[PDB]
Amino acid sequence: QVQLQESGPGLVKPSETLSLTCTVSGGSISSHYWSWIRQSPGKGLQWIGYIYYSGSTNYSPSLKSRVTISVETAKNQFSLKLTSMTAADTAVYYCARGPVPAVFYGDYRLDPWGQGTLVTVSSASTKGPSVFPLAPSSKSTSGGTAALGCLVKDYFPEPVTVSWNSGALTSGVHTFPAVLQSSGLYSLSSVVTVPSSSLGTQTYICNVNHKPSNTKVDKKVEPKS
Amino acid sequence: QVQLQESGPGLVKPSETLSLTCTVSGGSISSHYWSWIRQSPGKGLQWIGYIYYSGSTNYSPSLKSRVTISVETAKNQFSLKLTSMTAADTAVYYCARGPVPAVFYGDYRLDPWGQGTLVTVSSASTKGPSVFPLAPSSKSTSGGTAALGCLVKDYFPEPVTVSWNSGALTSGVHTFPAVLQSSGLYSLSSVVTVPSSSLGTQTYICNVNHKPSNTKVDKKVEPKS
Amino acid sequence: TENFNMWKNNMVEQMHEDIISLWDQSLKPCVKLTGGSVITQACPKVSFEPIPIHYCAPAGFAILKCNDKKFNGTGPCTNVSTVQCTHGIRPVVSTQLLLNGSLAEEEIVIRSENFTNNAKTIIVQLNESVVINCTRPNNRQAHCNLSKTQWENTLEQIAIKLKEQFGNNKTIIFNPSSGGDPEIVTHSFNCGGEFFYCNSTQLFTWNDRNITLPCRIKQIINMWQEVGKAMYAPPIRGQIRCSSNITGLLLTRDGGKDTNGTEIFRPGGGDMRDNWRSELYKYKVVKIE
Amino acid sequence: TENFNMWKNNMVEQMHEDIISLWDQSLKPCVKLTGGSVITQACPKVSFEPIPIHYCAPAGFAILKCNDKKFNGTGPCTNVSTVQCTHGIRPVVSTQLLLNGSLAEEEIVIRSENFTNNAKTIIVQLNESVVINCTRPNNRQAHCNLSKTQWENTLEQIAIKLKEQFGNNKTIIFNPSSGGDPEIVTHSFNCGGEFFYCNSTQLFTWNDRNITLPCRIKQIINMWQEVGKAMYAPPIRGQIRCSSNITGLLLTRDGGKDTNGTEIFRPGGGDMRDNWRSELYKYKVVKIE
Amino acid sequence: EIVLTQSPGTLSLSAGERATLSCRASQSVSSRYLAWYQQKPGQAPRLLIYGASSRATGIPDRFSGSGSGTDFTLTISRVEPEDFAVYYCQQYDNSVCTFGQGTKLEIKRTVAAPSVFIFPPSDEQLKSGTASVVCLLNNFYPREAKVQWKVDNALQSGNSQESVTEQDSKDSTYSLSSTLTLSKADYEKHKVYACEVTHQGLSSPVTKSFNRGEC
Amino acid sequence: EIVLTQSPGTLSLSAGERATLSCRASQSVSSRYLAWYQQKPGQAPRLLIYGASSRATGIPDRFSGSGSGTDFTLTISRVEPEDFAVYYCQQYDNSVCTFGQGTKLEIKRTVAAPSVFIFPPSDEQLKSGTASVVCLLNNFYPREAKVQWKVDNALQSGNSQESVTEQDSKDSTYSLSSTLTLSKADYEKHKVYACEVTHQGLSSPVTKSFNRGEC
Ligand SMILES: *C1O[C@H](CO)[C@@H](O)[C@H](O)[C@H]1NC(C)=O
Ligand SMILES: *[C@@H]1O[C@H](CO)[C@@H](O)[C@H](O)[C@H]1NC(C)=O
Ligand SMILES: *[C@@H]1O[C@H](CO)[C@@H](O)[C@H](O)[C@H]1NC(C)=O
Ligand SMILES: *[C@@H]1O[C@H](CO)[C@@H](O)[C@H](O)[C@H]1NC(C)=O
Ligand SMILES: *[C@@H]1O[C@H](CO)[C@@H](O)[C@H](O)[C@H]1NC(C)=O
Ligand SMILES: *[C@@H]1O[C@H](CO)[C@@H](O)[C@H](O)[C@H]1NC(C)=O
Ligand SMILES: *[C@@H]1O[C@H](CO)[C@@H](O)[C@H](O)[C@H]1NC(C)=O
Ligand SMILES: *[C@@H]1O[C@H](CO)[C@@H](O)[C@H](O)[C@H]1NC(C)=O
Ligand SMILES: *[C@@H]1O[C@H](CO)[C@@H](O)[C@H](O)[C@H]1NC(C)=O
Ligand SMILES: *[C@@H]1O[C@H](CO)[C@@H](O)[C@H](O)[C@H]1NC(C)=O
Ligand SMILES: *[C@@H]1O[C@H](CO)[C@@H](O)[C@H](O)[C@H]1NC(C)=O
Ligand SMILES: *[C@@H]1O[C@H](CO)[C@@H](O)[C@H](O)[C@H]1NC(C)=O
Ligand SMILES: *[C@@H]1O[C@H](CO)[C@@H](O)[C@H](O)[C@H]1NC(C)=O
Ligand SMILES: *[C@@H]1O[C@H](CO)[C@@H](O)[C@H](O)[C@H]1NC(C)=O
Ligand SMILES: *[C@@H]1O[C@H](CO)[C@@H](O)[C@H](O)[C@H]1NC(C)=O
Ligand SMILES: *[C@@H]1O[C@H](CO)[C@@H](O)[C@H](O)[C@H]1NC(C)=O
Ligand SMILES: *[C@@H]1O[C@H](CO)[C@@H](O)[C@H](O)[C@H]1NC(C)=O
Ligand SMILES: *[C@@H]1O[C@H](CO)[C@@H](O)[C@H](O)[C@H]1NC(C)=O
Ligand SMILES: *[C@@H]1O[C@H](CO)[C@@H](O)[C@H](O)[C@H]1NC(C)=O
Ligand SMILES: *[C@@H]1O[C@H](CO)[C@@H](O)[C@H](O)[C@H]1NC(C)=O
Ligand SMILES: *[C@@H]1O[C@H](CO)[C@@H](O)[C@H](O)[C@H]1NC(C)=O
Ligand SMILES: *[C@@H]1O[C@H](CO)[C@@H](O)[C@H](O)[C@H]1NC(C)=O
Ligand SMILES: *[C@@H]1O[C@H](CO)[C@@H](O)[C@H](O)[C@H]1NC(C)=O
Ligand SMILES: *[C@@H]1O[C@H](CO)[C@@H](O)[C@H](O)[C@H]1NC(C)=O
Ligand SMILES: *[C@@H]1O[C@H](CO)[C@@H](O)[C@H](O)[C@H]1NC(C)=O
Ligand SMILES: *[C@@H]1O[C@H](CO)[C@@H](O)[C@H](O)[C@H]1NC(C)=O
Ligand SMILES: *[C@@H]1O[C@H](CO)[C@@H](O)[C@H](O)[C@H]1NC(C)=O
């Protein structure tokens, strides 16, 4: 099926401009309309504008002055350009097909979407996380199931993404929203619960990704004894 | 072929109204437009208005206030009505088909016409003509051809129409324009020329018609000896 | 208790208007445009051909469709559905013969605003269509062909419907149209802005295996063209497909003192409004409240 | 020394505009009129069907028609007649398959704004038409039939013209269209304001007579207006049939690292402007002075 | 509303020559709506040309129409003796049909002397108390001629009227008649009633006459 | 330009119940142009309904759309645990595409007590000069709970932060983590590190803990 994939700087300095790129696969930009949409944390959705594969564009009025949407059908992608970024522009940016149908008798809707990219407007530098194990207790509930995890500490900006044993282990996993430490750096933890019996044989590695800093870390979590 | 035939009072008193009727034969009023047109003596042609067989009409602006054109398709004729006749209204009145074509892609023109009727506005009474022979001279040119005719005298109003031997004899005939005698009555003569040899055998009768007075006269013209 | 009068139905007048417009529209040339924002100067011209058209009521109004079997066209109607639009009609410009129209539901049906009134036209609606082929001179003299025994058959069927209407103790005769405009006298008709005129003497001389009608082709010939002749000749007019379905006739009856039990009929009745009338007869526009 | 570029020809954009208008026009209802002088309230609506249309230049302008045999569509043209209007075109709304169009003068002809650029659509113009009859369920239901051995024949003929274009040492394969809008993926098309969608998987799976396609019919989800049951439901439109002539295709070619002498083609290419483009390719509007 | 102005008020030529009559509209006019008509004396007008250049049926092809916009032209290639008529251009526009004031076409020919005849009043009329004597000038050209009545050699005045025909259709000539009108009384107190005609086609003035009582 | 106002800001019910979310436009709007979207936490929105009442493909039929003109309604017949999401109506008109502010759908369920775990700082991290102690409250409901850190029985304040998950997709519960953050120095001058949790699902406050140096 058709799949979209945004990509671009997680971080952007104040007053400077934003550039993003959505990449299509499974389908073709040809014949279709393509939109960018953004959503501020906790806030609602805001349509930015679209471009016809032809090249003609149409922007949201309240943004018109600062927006540029380009297309490169040859390489099968389209792009965003946002001028004079400010804190108010910090958001998740999505690409999506539509909302206008290819043909006049088609249907009006935003379909496939992207995953979205979190863009942060800040002068602060990028900083990679430090990962620490949350060693499982031989006490906690060694009759039944126990809990362990990873402490991802002191990184900027957001986000990070954890998985376990390369995403083999998925259920019983909780990754917490990050918290902003007074140091101006984020920190979160991800945890999972597993039958105590398994502690001895099964091995556990969390896989931490921090794209903004090009960091990929794999920390082995195990019982301290 | 299609033939039109006007008919109505030769004479109309001042301030009174005029009524005329055109009668169609060879064709049908149905589907067609029908016009009345008038021409004053020596003057030019003036379109009065028309009626669609449907019944809708259209009058000349300078006459609108006084004109009524009716149609009676049942009997295959249409009619004129002119209000407040004055000397200025004395004219020959023609009916004619058109000028608008039956269908939108037809041709615009006035065709077949009528013969026209001469209408005279006057308080004077109608008076029948008196006809007198213009006996041929045994002198004039009794070697070759001689001339004879009819004197149509003291009639009103116009017109009269002469023919010879019931229109068998036509060539060599001249009928003169009428003249208005100080008596207020018209008078004209019609003449014809014929080989002298024929005077003895051939017989000559002029046929005088004065419709306004319902007069038809046939006077025998011959040599006085 | 619902009234219909096909003979006073502004829908007819209205349609005629539109057809006329469609015609003028097809003659005017493109007006050159102005402003820095014009795509091309090329303007679209729709050729003068039968266009599928519905007629429709605005909100607060509606169209009544009479559905009575063999409806009189005038008077009350019992099975009257109410609709928003008429059926689609591809109206054909013609005289004498109604073309490409609707067929009488069951058997031949005739209609007149009055039958005693010989002035009023009679509209025939056939229950069985009659085909007729006509061709542009390969540019082979313009003409039209017709199934003879099929046509003669039709005339007989019509005669019957008239005997019924005028007392069947009478003899029916068809004569060609008498004097009138060329279009009225001939069977004329549109074909892409070119008009055929056809000697239908052979079509209307009937009493008690195919027919060929000779035709002329009057062309557009202006207007709005003076001092403008720099290009070539027409585009798609080599051998035009004009062939069609005869679905009706316009007739008128003679009325002289000396016609006894004997009735004469002829080919062309009224104006073209009567064409539209033959399709719109079962409809009426009316207000809601 | 005369230039033509069918791929940048505002006439295409312009025509598309008009077709769109014709569509909106066909959706809006009648606006009630005012004034003591209105014939009826019934306004004429022209149904959404292929209308014969010429395009024409205003005075001081003209249209150039390229007449070169098997014209490239782009570049110079030698036999260029200058005319006032285009031929009449009855444009058909569709995807994948071009319908009721002009046939290639001699043999199959293909065109693209670039053949090395796989992004650019390829327009096929057939020299021999392929018939296709389509029917609706009277409310197998809602499909289309096609001469198999005749179609397979065509694909082969096309493959040849591509081998010529891309070096005939290559193998040609046809695949159904991949992901996209429903209309783009299926072969969809208009039929009086109702739109067919047709699974053309069977049309585009080729290698080395009757074919039936499963179709669905989408009725215009009336954009304008609502709550109109004071009128009931609309049956008499028209009814038509969409049995028609396939005179072309829109294709696009795949471009992956691992395709060797082997080329894949699929059935949907660009937007509908490309439809118009296939008829208008040999024309251009230009100014006089 | 449009105003049609015709080409020359009067136009006069010989047979065989070419005639050009123009018609000029106050405004611009479509050719479909312009027509020409021919009116011979004593008759209704006859449609000559419709749609500017279309020849009415039955009309001799020596007539042709032309022009457009504002200026239009009727043309007769080879004038005939009976092409003698008044010619009107007409148009229909804006629901109104107007004519030009027409162009009189006159024919030129060779000089022709009249044949003169004189007629005594009939006995029938003398019974009435009035007497009419008539002088006929037959088929002559050109138009200017002069009659003189003499009664017993006394020249008459203000007691006679005369009338002239329009140019002939075949030969393009005129004929004239004069009528001396007396009361029976006066008529019967004179013997020689004489009519004298002077015309360009007569080397010497011609007198026809008679005697009352005698022939 | 149009403004879309959604139904109840927040809407909260149990599984099996029927959910009604409305969307009201500042003006009148054609149904072709109205769509609904479902956004689960952490994900992009998914098209739910297009053309007012047309179900997007793959979407469970327990969703339906309705309404026209100004008022539109998304309806879920039988709410599921993972129907937990924010729901947006959207329209495109006049070249502009707007959304409502959305309706948060929350799920009601039975009270559930957390499972508590405590984590000592790693040796790896102690090397860094800072110590993080972590308390995990797992799968509990409702949301309101309270952690208390005690170091050698001394109650802590302003030296710990906590974070909570969104309701679960399967069981609709919350999980919470608190982080006590000390410097290596401070951490190493206390033995009993204890975490106390009070929650409605606990008849009595639960305390997990450990000793530094020991387990
Ligand atoms: C093409 O399709 C045919 C019949 O469906 C099949 O036999 C052949 O293997 C295919 N060729 C390819 C893709 O190699
Ligand atoms: C009216 O409808 C009824 C059935 O409801 C039917 O019997 C009748 O024939 C219809 N039309 C006429 C001719 O009255
Ligand atoms: C048929 O016409 C007559 C008079 O022409 C009228 O009285 C009657 O109502 C009509 N019949 C029908 C079926 O409406
Ligand atoms: C059509 O009507 C005619 C005349 O009323 C009749 O002869 C014929 O049987 C009917 N049906 C056909 C064959 O179309
Ligand atoms: C029908 O026409 C006849 C003949 O003219 C007439 O007498 C009768 O009144 C007409 N019927 C009407 C008008 O109702
Ligand atoms: C032409 O007329 C004939 C004779 O009726 C008819 O059978 C045929 O269908 C028409 N069309 C063509 C293409 O010849
Ligand atoms: C077209 O050419 C043909 C010769 O086939 C000839 O009739 C005429 O010049 C043109 N057609 C008509 C009838 O106008
Ligand atoms: C009769 O019509 C046919 C086509 O319908 C036509 O080709 C033929 O010329 C016509 N009659 C003759 C002369 O065969
Ligand atoms: C054409 O019409 C004339 C008169 O209308 C007629 O005399 C002639 O016979 C007709 N031609 C044929 C053979 O139909
Ligand atoms: C049939 O019609 C022809 C027309 O030419 C005519 O000569 C003949 O007398 C008619 N026969 C009858 C029965 O009236
Ligand atoms: C009647 O219908 C046929 C087939 O639809 C069409 O080709 C023809 O042009 C129509 N007739 C006329 C004269 O318009
Ligand atoms: C004529 O009408 C019939 C229905 O009676 C229809 O099937 C066909 O399309 C038409 N044929 C022609 C020649 O246009
Ligand atoms: C009129 O009656 C006459 C006898 O009076 C008779 O010939 C016929 O029935 C009628 N006229 C004709 C010739 O049809
Ligand atoms: C034939 O029958 C009609 C209808 O009743 C009747 O008027 C008359 O007796 C006959 N026709 C005439 C008027 O001769
Ligand atoms: C074919 O295409 C090329 C590139 O667009 C062009 O230069 C050339 O003129 C074309 N050949 C012709 C004239 O068919
Ligand atoms: C252009 O037209 C001529 C005829 O005048 C034709 O023979 C020639 O083949 C054409 N030129 C080219 C190169 O196509
Ligand atoms: C049309 O072209 C194709 C190959 O290009 C060929 O199969 C066909 O025979 C050609 N000619 C015809 C019959 O139109
Ligand atoms: C034609 O397409 C190819 C493929 O990208 C490219 O190399 C060439 O530059 C294209 N022509 C253009 C874009 O001018
Ligand atoms: C159309 O739908 C109706 C349901 O009301 C049904 O009776 C009919 O069979 C349907 N048509 C088909 C065959 O799809
Ligand atoms: C083929 O198409 C025709 C209509 O064109 C249809 O009647 C038939 O059912 C289709 N397929 C089959 C089963 O033959
Ligand atoms: C209908 O479609 C079939 C192909 O499926 C074709 O053979 C036929 O010509 C088409 N139309 C007719 C005449 O039935
Ligand atoms: C296929 O094209 C290639 C060019 O890449 C060429 O080397 C080879 O000769 C071709 N294959 C043939 C003709 O067998
Ligand atoms: C229907 O289309 C789908 C994909 O759109 C395809 O997988 C399937 O094979 C097609 N079915 C038929 C019967 O053609
Ligand atoms: C299936 O296809 C043909 C077209 O060739 C179509 O006309 C008809 O419905 C069917 N005929 C056959 C071959 O069974
Ligand atoms: C193509 O033209 C034919 C004949 O005019 C028509 O029947 C068919 O519906 C047209 N195609 C479409 C779907 O517009
Ligand atoms: C297909 O096209 C041909 C000519 O291009 C035409 O004669 C035929 O009627 C068309 N088929 C239909 C009716 O769709
Ligand atoms: C595989 O395909 C490529 C085309 O991209 C071609 O150049 C290559 O020669 C092929 N592999 C071999 C070695 O045959």
Side-chain angles (χ1 to χ4, degrees), chain D residues 23 218 220-224 226, chain F residues 30-33 54 68-69:
Chain D
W23 187 56
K218 187 181 183 183
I220 308 169
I221 312 168
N222 278 7
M223 205 166 325
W224 281 76
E226 192 222 326
Chain F
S30 177
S31 304
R32 258 229 330 200
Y33 307 103
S54 292
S68 47

PDB file of all heavy atoms in Angstrom, chain D residues 23 218 220-224 226, chain F residues 30-33 54 68-69:
ATOM      1  N   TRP D  23     -19.966  20.516 -15.258  1.00  0.00           N
ATOM      2  CA  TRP D  23     -20.331  19.593 -14.206  1.00  0.00           C
ATOM      3  C   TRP D  23     -21.027  20.293 -13.045  1.00  0.00           C
ATOM      4  O   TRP D  23     -22.079  19.848 -12.595  1.00  0.00           O
ATOM      5  CB  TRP D  23     -19.105  18.823 -13.733  1.00  0.00           C
ATOM      6  CG  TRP D  23     -19.443  17.752 -12.779  1.00  0.00           C
ATOM      7  CD1 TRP D  23     -20.312  16.722 -12.976  1.00  0.00           C
ATOM      8  CD2 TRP D  23     -18.923  17.596 -11.463  1.00  0.00           C
ATOM      9  NE1 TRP D  23     -20.369  15.930 -11.857  1.00  0.00           N
ATOM     10  CE2 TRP D  23     -19.523  16.445 -10.912  1.00  0.00           C
ATOM     11  CE3 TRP D  23     -18.006  18.316 -10.695  1.00  0.00           C
ATOM     12  CZ2 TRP D  23     -19.237  16.000  -9.629  1.00  0.00           C
ATOM     13  CZ3 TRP D  23     -17.721  17.874  -9.425  1.00  0.00           C
ATOM     14  CH2 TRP D  23     -18.336  16.726  -8.901  1.00  0.00           C
ATOM     15  N   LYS D 218     -20.960   4.709  -9.061  1.00  0.00           N
ATOM     16  CA  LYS D 218     -21.055   5.756  -8.057  1.00  0.00           C
ATOM     17  C   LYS D 218     -21.957   6.869  -8.564  1.00  0.00           C
ATOM     18  O   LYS D 218     -21.706   7.457  -9.615  1.00  0.00           O
ATOM     19  CB  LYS D 218     -19.670   6.310  -7.722  1.00  0.00           C
ATOM     20  CG  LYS D 218     -19.640   7.296  -6.566  1.00  0.00           C
ATOM     21  CD  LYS D 218     -18.224   7.800  -6.323  1.00  0.00           C
ATOM     22  CE  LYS D 218     -18.150   8.726  -5.119  1.00  0.00           C
ATOM     23  NZ  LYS D 218     -16.778   9.278  -4.939  1.00  0.00           N
ATOM     24  N   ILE D 220     -23.529  10.611  -8.178  1.00  0.00           N
ATOM     25  CA  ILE D 220     -23.122  11.898  -7.630  1.00  0.00           C
ATOM     26  C   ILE D 220     -23.777  12.152  -6.281  1.00  0.00           C
ATOM     27  O   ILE D 220     -24.996  12.306  -6.197  1.00  0.00           O
ATOM     28  CB  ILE D 220     -23.522  13.060  -8.560  1.00  0.00           C
ATOM     29  CG1 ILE D 220     -23.022  12.820  -9.989  1.00  0.00           C
ATOM     30  CG2 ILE D 220     -23.001  14.381  -8.007  1.00  0.00           C
ATOM     31  CD1 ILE D 220     -23.610  13.781 -11.017  1.00  0.00           C
ATOM     32  N   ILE D 221     -22.964  12.196  -5.230  1.00  0.00           N
ATOM     33  CA  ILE D 221     -23.455  12.522  -3.896  1.00  0.00           C
ATOM     34  C   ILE D 221     -23.867  13.989  -3.805  1.00  0.00           C
ATOM     35  O   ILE D 221     -23.118  14.822  -3.295  1.00  0.00           O
ATOM     36  CB  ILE D 221     -22.396  12.228  -2.817  1.00  0.00           C
ATOM     37  CG1 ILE D 221     -21.803  10.832  -3.020  1.00  0.00           C
ATOM     38  CG2 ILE D 221     -23.001  12.359  -1.428  1.00  0.00           C
ATOM     39  CD1 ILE D 221     -20.562  10.571  -2.195  1.00  0.00           C
ATOM     40  N   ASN D 222     -25.061  14.295  -4.302  1.00  0.00           N
ATOM     41  CA  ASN D 222     -25.406  15.660  -4.680  1.00  0.00           C
ATOM     42  C   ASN D 222     -24.673  16.621  -3.749  1.00  0.00           C
ATOM     43  O   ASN D 222     -24.918  16.640  -2.543  1.00  0.00           O
ATOM     44  CB  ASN D 222     -26.924  15.849  -4.677  1.00  0.00           C
ATOM     45  CG  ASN D 222     -27.576  15.343  -5.948  1.00  0.00           C
ATOM     46  OD1 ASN D 222     -26.926  14.723  -6.789  1.00  0.00           O
ATOM     47  ND2 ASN D 222     -28.870  15.608  -6.096  1.00  0.00           N
ATOM     48  N   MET D 223     -23.775  17.419  -4.318  1.00  0.00           N
ATOM     49  CA  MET D 223     -23.054  18.429  -3.554  1.00  0.00           C
ATOM     50  C   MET D 223     -24.038  19.513  -3.126  1.00  0.00           C
ATOM     51  O   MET D 223     -23.984  20.004  -1.998  1.00  0.00           O
ATOM     52  CB  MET D 223     -21.932  19.040  -4.396  1.00  0.00           C
ATOM     53  CG  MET D 223     -20.788  19.619  -3.580  1.00  0.00           C
ATOM     54  SD  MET D 223     -19.323  19.955  -4.576  1.00  0.00           S
ATOM     55  CE  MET D 223     -19.397  18.605  -5.751  1.00  0.00           C
ATOM     56  N   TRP D 224     -24.936  19.881  -4.033  1.00  0.00           N
ATOM     57  CA  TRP D 224     -25.866  20.977  -3.789  1.00  0.00           C
ATOM     58  C   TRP D 224     -27.189  20.463  -3.229  1.00  0.00           C
ATOM     59  O   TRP D 224     -27.843  19.614  -3.835  1.00  0.00           O
ATOM     60  CB  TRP D 224     -26.114  21.767  -5.076  1.00  0.00           C
ATOM     61  CG  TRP D 224     -25.012  22.725  -5.410  1.00  0.00           C
ATOM     62  CD1 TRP D 224     -23.789  22.420  -5.931  1.00  0.00           C
ATOM     63  CD2 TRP D 224     -25.034  24.150  -5.248  1.00  0.00           C
ATOM     64  NE1 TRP D 224     -23.047  23.564  -6.103  1.00  0.00           N
ATOM     65  CE2 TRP D 224     -23.789  24.639  -5.691  1.00  0.00           C
ATOM     66  CE3 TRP D 224     -25.985  25.057  -4.771  1.00  0.00           C
ATOM     67  CZ2 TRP D 224     -23.471  25.996  -5.670  1.00  0.00           C
ATOM     68  CZ3 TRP D 224     -25.667  26.403  -4.752  1.00  0.00           C
ATOM     69  CH2 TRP D 224     -24.420  26.859  -5.198  1.00  0.00           C
ATOM     70  N   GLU D 226     -30.530  19.475  -0.496  1.00  0.00           N
ATOM     71  CA  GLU D 226     -30.947  18.292   0.262  1.00  0.00           C
ATOM     72  C   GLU D 226     -32.422  18.443   0.666  1.00  0.00           C
ATOM     73  O   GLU D 226     -33.073  19.420   0.289  1.00  0.00           O
ATOM     74  CB  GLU D 226     -30.079  18.039   1.498  1.00  0.00           C
ATOM     75  CG  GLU D 226     -30.289  16.678   2.146  1.00  0.00           C
ATOM     76  CD  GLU D 226     -30.336  16.763   3.661  1.00  0.00           C
ATOM     77  OE1 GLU D 226     -29.626  17.620   4.232  1.00  0.00           O
ATOM     78  OE2 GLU D 226     -31.090  15.979   4.283  1.00  0.00           O
TER      79      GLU D 226
ATOM     80  N   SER F  30     -21.657  21.265   2.601  1.00  0.00           N
ATOM     81  CA  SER F  30     -22.016  20.081   1.842  1.00  0.00           C
ATOM     82  C   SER F  30     -21.409  18.838   2.480  1.00  0.00           C
ATOM     83  O   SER F  30     -20.278  18.865   2.962  1.00  0.00           O
ATOM     84  CB  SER F  30     -21.549  20.216   0.395  1.00  0.00           C
ATOM     85  OG  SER F  30     -21.823  19.038  -0.341  1.00  0.00           O
ATOM     86  N   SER F  31     -22.169  17.750   2.474  1.00  0.00           N
ATOM     87  CA  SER F  31     -21.746  16.508   3.104  1.00  0.00           C
ATOM     88  C   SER F  31     -20.539  15.866   2.431  1.00  0.00           C
ATOM     89  O   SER F  31     -19.794  15.141   3.084  1.00  0.00           O
ATOM     90  CB  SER F  31     -22.905  15.517   3.160  1.00  0.00           C
ATOM     91  OG  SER F  31     -24.012  16.088   3.834  1.00  0.00           O
ATOM     92  N   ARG F  32     -20.337  16.122   1.138  1.00  0.00           N
ATOM     93  CA  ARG F  32     -19.166  15.561   0.451  1.00  0.00           C
ATOM     94  C   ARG F  32     -17.871  15.930   1.152  1.00  0.00           C
ATOM     95  O   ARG F  32     -16.891  15.190   1.079  1.00  0.00           O
ATOM     96  CB  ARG F  32     -19.056  16.006  -1.019  1.00  0.00           C
ATOM     97  CG  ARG F  32     -19.501  14.953  -2.024  1.00  0.00           C
ATOM     98  CD  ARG F  32     -18.548  14.655  -3.219  1.00  0.00           C
ATOM     99  NE  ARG F  32     -17.684  15.728  -3.716  1.00  0.00           N
ATOM    100  CZ  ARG F  32     -17.137  15.720  -4.936  1.00  0.00           C
ATOM    101  NH1 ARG F  32     -17.404  14.731  -5.778  1.00  0.00           N
ATOM    102  NH2 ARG F  32     -16.341  16.703  -5.332  1.00  0.00           N
ATOM    103  N   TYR F  33     -17.876  17.073   1.832  1.00  0.00           N
ATOM    104  CA  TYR F  33     -16.639  17.690   2.304  1.00  0.00           C
ATOM    105  C   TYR F  33     -16.353  17.491   3.790  1.00  0.00           C
ATOM    106  O   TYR F  33     -15.312  17.920   4.293  1.00  0.00           O
ATOM    107  CB  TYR F  33     -16.639  19.179   1.954  1.00  0.00           C
ATOM    108  CG  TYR F  33     -16.905  19.427   0.491  1.00  0.00           C
ATOM    109  CD1 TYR F  33     -18.147  19.869   0.058  1.00  0.00           C
ATOM    110  CD2 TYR F  33     -15.922  19.190  -0.461  1.00  0.00           C
ATOM    111  CE1 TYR F  33     -18.397  20.085  -1.281  1.00  0.00           C
ATOM    112  CE2 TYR F  33     -16.160  19.405  -1.799  1.00  0.00           C
ATOM    113  CZ  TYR F  33     -17.398  19.851  -2.204  1.00  0.00           C
ATOM    114  OH  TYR F  33     -17.634  20.062  -3.541  1.00  0.00           O
ATOM    115  N   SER F  54     -19.684   8.082   4.775  1.00  0.00           N
ATOM    116  CA  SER F  54     -18.977   6.986   4.129  1.00  0.00           C
ATOM    117  C   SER F  54     -17.832   6.475   4.989  1.00  0.00           C
ATOM    118  O   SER F  54     -16.919   7.225   5.353  1.00  0.00           O
ATOM    119  CB  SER F  54     -18.454   7.412   2.763  1.00  0.00           C
ATOM    120  OG  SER F  54     -19.522   7.642   1.867  1.00  0.00           O
ATOM    121  N   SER F  68     -26.097  16.731   8.159  1.00  0.00           N
ATOM    122  CA  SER F  68     -25.820  17.575   7.001  1.00  0.00           C
ATOM    123  C   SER F  68     -26.125  19.030   7.334  1.00  0.00           C
ATOM    124  O   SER F  68     -26.604  19.338   8.425  1.00  0.00           O
ATOM    125  CB  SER F  68     -26.632  17.118   5.788  1.00  0.00           C
ATOM    126  OG  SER F  68     -27.985  16.909   6.143  1.00  0.00           O
ATOM    127  N   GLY F  69     -25.839  19.924   6.394  1.00  0.00           N
ATOM    128  CA  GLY F  69     -26.124  21.338   6.588  1.00  0.00           C
ATOM    129  C   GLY F  69     -25.150  21.978   7.552  1.00  0.00           C
ATOM    130  O   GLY F  69     -24.115  22.496   7.144  1.00  0.00           O
TER     131      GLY F  69
END
